[PDB]
């Protein structure tokens, strides 16, 4: 697969607590399908390093589905990025 067009994502389910200590979300994609999703997260203070620990391996958009993403994030102020689609995620705890 090729990489999903970073400009063609929208939120279907915004990032939310999963009930088992993870962050789940769902996106819709409006480019060529199928494709591999570029998903990352960035901590305030370090714009270069992907801090998202993916539980869903190799997330993809298929023709008939895909777009569910599950991850864990470090404590503090983060931003989640699916392509260029973004959402803040402040992670409580330690």
């Amino acid at each position, epitope marked *: 697969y090729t990489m999903c067009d970073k*400009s063609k994502f929208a939120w279907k389910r915004t990032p939310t607590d999963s009930g088992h200590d993870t962050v789940v979300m769902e996106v819709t994609f409006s*480019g060529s399908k199928p494709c591999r999703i570029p998903v990352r997260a960035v901590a305030h203070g370090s714009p270069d390093v992907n801090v998202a620990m993916l539980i869903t391996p190799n997330p993809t958009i298929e023709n008939d589905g895909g777009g569910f993403i599950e991850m864990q994030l470090p404590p503090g102020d983060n931003i989640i990025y699916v392509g260029e689609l973004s959402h803040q995620w402040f992670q409580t705890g330690s």
Partner: antibody
Amino acid sequence: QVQLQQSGPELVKPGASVKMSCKASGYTFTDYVIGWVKQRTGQGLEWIGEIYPGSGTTYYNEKFKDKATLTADKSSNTAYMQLSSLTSEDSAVYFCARGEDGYYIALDYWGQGTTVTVSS
Amino acid sequence: DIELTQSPASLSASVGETVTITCRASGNIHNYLAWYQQKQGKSPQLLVYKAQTLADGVPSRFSGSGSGTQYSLKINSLQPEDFGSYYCQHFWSTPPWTFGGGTKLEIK
């Protein structure tokens, strides 16, 4: 250079169907989306839909999903739009245009337009 | 859906002068804004993409700017070939890739 060559005018009765073509040359057909745009005389541009020839993926404007059908033929580097059940509301110029598959941010080259005139 | 509202609807100006026309989006489109010029009876021509990048062959007297929901196209030193209708279009995140209603520039 990039060229999108569209087919000739269609003067048809209400209720007819038409199929127009858009032949691409000067680039790799499957690396670029083909979008279609409607323009009534003296009015603005309207996005109909698009096809990714490399994958077959299509997107349709909700207002046209019962009116337009988009297909593509990789072997002939040709994209097709079919319009069904024509009314006078369908009389317009229809353009095909090219965008980049994978970072689709503009219709960067445009065909010359196919005029459809629905007439008694 | 995103609505794009272009302003002014029409304007008349003279060769050599400057004009500014604008395109307002109903939601944030993250600079995914393209500008086209269309002469009467001709096909649209891409002028600007990603709100500020000139397309190939477009002269530097065109400049695109803006962000968020507000975008501007400025034409310095108008030339006779600059008449026509100008349209904006967005490509952010989900179709329809709607067009603004157009601005008609007449060279006085």
